[model samples]
Target: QGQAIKCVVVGDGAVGKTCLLISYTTNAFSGEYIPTVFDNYSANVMVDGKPVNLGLWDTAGQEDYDRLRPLSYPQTDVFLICFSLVSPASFENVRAKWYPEVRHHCPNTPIILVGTKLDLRDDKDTIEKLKEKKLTPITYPQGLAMAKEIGAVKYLECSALTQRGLKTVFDEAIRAVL
Candidate 1:
């Protein structure tokens, strides 16, 4: 391959990590929760008329896989810290846990805060109830705050089910490298 950018997608289990990757790479959405076990994919895109290959490492989200975190972080140029907008707990996990883990491993890597599963929000009524319980929904304002606090290059929203904001995520990641 030619010059390539190495990226990693990390988040808690069931946060739609696989779906986000699939939606961007294949432009197809798979409305299912499939656990990722160290799966990796690569694609080449032209940036400024030069071919830039992207090496994306998709790691399993389970905390049991913490042992593998170190191996995944080194030499990584970009990191996508994903969380589900529907579940505030996932958002909190990225802030309190994943962000620090990545910083400890790869201090200078550009991290992008990502909220996935936007499409399903309209169909799920439980989200409103959760909000009434004083739980914060992962809105753009909150995402931006977390991104700023953790020094993320930017924030993006994506829906693997509806394919919303898929391209924005990849574009922002590429821009961060430039």
Candidate 2:
């Protein structure tokens, strides 16, 4: 019934993709939110002086959803392809998995590469866990580099718990479509 932007979030499971959505819509973080419905969220907001109905869609990045996830990709305008700063595998999958899948379904859609779990990137325990596996947190430059490589509209980082950089991720999604 109005101007709307379809923004879909895709990434490896447990990379905080859902947390980002919960924090953005509810303005609060809950560690145990698993939307049993898997529904879309709509938020009306003004971006650069224009009112827009932002339709946010969430996708499962798990292997179990491989056959069903792209069912929601048809009318998508933009995508937020996310990863965790503390999980190198999630970061690697941007190019290895998520990007390929998105591009296959929506060849021309704009994408914003997102790095989640920013709050844990520096936590001593988080670092120690990664170190045990001989891995390190992904750096800002690495994310930006991936964006360039993937042809994403932008590269962003955020923590759903702290809410740092979270809003900008969505704002950029709106702007990318604008």
The candidate scoring highest on TM-score is: 2
Residue 74 miss distance in model 1 (angstroms): 1.0
In candidate 2, stretches whose alpha carbon ends up further than 4 angstroms from where it belongs are 33-37
lDDT of 2 by residue, 76-130 (tens): 9999999999989999999999999999999999999999999998899999998
On the 0 to 100 scale, the lDDT of residue 66 in model 2 is: 84
Candidate 1 Cα errors over 4 Å, as ranges: 124-134
Estimate every model's Cα lDDT from 0 to 1: 0.84, 0.89
Q: Supply candidate 1's per-residue lDDT for 174.
A: 80
Error of 1 at 149 (Å): 0.5
- For candidate 2, which ten residues in a row score worst on lDDT? 30-39
Displacement of the residue 118 alpha carbon in candidate 1, Å: 1.6
